[PDB]
């Protein structure tokens, strides 16, 4: 077998003597097979089959109406690519937990179970907030900001946290709950303000539940 030997063998000998007939018969039996599958399967498999069949019906109806209308009748990618290419060209051209452990060595601990934002790498907090530990992984540095106009969504760095309506204590710490307005750098977006002027930092409302879904999503306020 050097090259496309099955079609060479079909050219030299042909197929089975029964292939066309039984292929037609299977194509005909397909409907009864589908009905039996719909009426007999059970346990996650009927669920997968039902979702697949519902989808397939959706595209089938879409195709039917598309052909009907055509027979009767006789920039977000660009913006994202520009921002990403600018970033690529620009590129081309101790922890609080161990600190608190050392303090303890030298229920008294409360650890915040909600995502937060710090900013500066190392900070020694005033004693009023010293014992509010925040874990390593739960912070998020950048947020997915969706711009209501121009219909573009871009990942932009988080500047700071301004107001968490759930708790002023969460606000002061930097807890990122649902609907929480933070300050976001929008230099990459390049929106032009009055006097033909550009803006760098703007309000964005975190609108998801980051504890439910780690990815942090905000809608920009313009």
């Amino acid at each position: 077998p050097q090259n496309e030997y099955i079609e060479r063998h079909r050219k030299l000998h042909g197929r089975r003597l029964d292939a066309e007939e039984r292929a037609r018969k299977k194509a005909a039996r397909e409907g009864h097979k589908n009905s039996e599958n719909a009426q007999n399967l059970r346990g996650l498999r009927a669920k997968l089959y039902a979702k697949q069949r519902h989808a397939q019906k959706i595209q089938m109806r879409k195709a039917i109406k598309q052909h009907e209308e055509r027979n009767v009748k006789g920039t977000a990618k660009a913006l994202s690519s520009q921002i990403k290419n600018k970033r690529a060209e620009k590129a081309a051209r101790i922890s609080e937990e161990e600190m608190f452990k050392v303090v303890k060595t030298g229920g008294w601990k409360r650890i915040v179970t909600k995502p937060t934002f710090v900013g500066p790498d190392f900070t020694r907090r005033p004693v009023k907030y010293e014992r509010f530990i925040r874990p390593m992984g739960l912070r998020y540095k950048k947020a997915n900001v969706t711009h209501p106009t121009l219909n573009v969504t871009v990942q932009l760095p988080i500047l700071s946290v301004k107001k968490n309506p759930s708790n002023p204590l969460y606000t002061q710490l930097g807890v990122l709950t649902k609907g929480t307005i933070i300050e976001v750098n929008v230099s990459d977006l390049g929106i032009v303000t009055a006097s033909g002027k550009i803006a760098w930092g703007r309000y964005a409302q975190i609108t998801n539940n980051p504890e439910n879904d780690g990815c942090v999503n905000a809608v920009l306020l313009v």
Partner: protein, 245 residues
Amino acid sequence: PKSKRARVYHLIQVNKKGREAKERLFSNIRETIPKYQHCFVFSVDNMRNNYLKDVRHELNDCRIFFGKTKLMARALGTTPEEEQADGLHRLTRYLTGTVGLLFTNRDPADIESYFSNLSQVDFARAGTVAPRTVTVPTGIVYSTGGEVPPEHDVPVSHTLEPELRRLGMPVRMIKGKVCLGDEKGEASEGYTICKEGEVLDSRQTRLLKLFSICLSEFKVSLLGYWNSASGEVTELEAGKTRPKR
């Protein structure tokens, strides 16, 4: 309720013609009645109708119509009370089956002579009577099945091999060559597709069509003709022989 055929939608441009097409046919026949003088009525009982296009191209001068017999007959006017011109009711009662109309401006005798001289070979339709015991040799099956001499005959295709096997030939495609029996020959006996006097069925007719064997004669039988001035129809030969209602 349930348990019904899955209707296969046709993802293709061409659609039903319908009521608009039928009223177009009324309009065409009714408007083409006045200009011409001799409205011939003819029959093509059991012949393939490819060569109607050629006879159209030949008698470019005339105008020919062929649809639903009922549709054309009533467009003419079956009842004499609702009739475009006298005698057209007679033409309608002539119109029964595989029947076409022929508006002409010229000599009926010349029309009759030309249509008598018209004669083409054709592949047989289903239901006819076979005149020959045509068969294929036990050796290699060729393009026409041995009608032309094998030395000047190209072999038939492995693409057509499955169709021949489906339609009944005990043929086998060995070493890329399609053969009834053995590649060298002999071994088997042979396959006679149809016999003398046998009523050809759809299977045998498809066999002759695949092997390019013609055993039918395309000819048009003029039932009659109606003159505009006289307003009467004169039947000739096929007119009286062919049953009509």
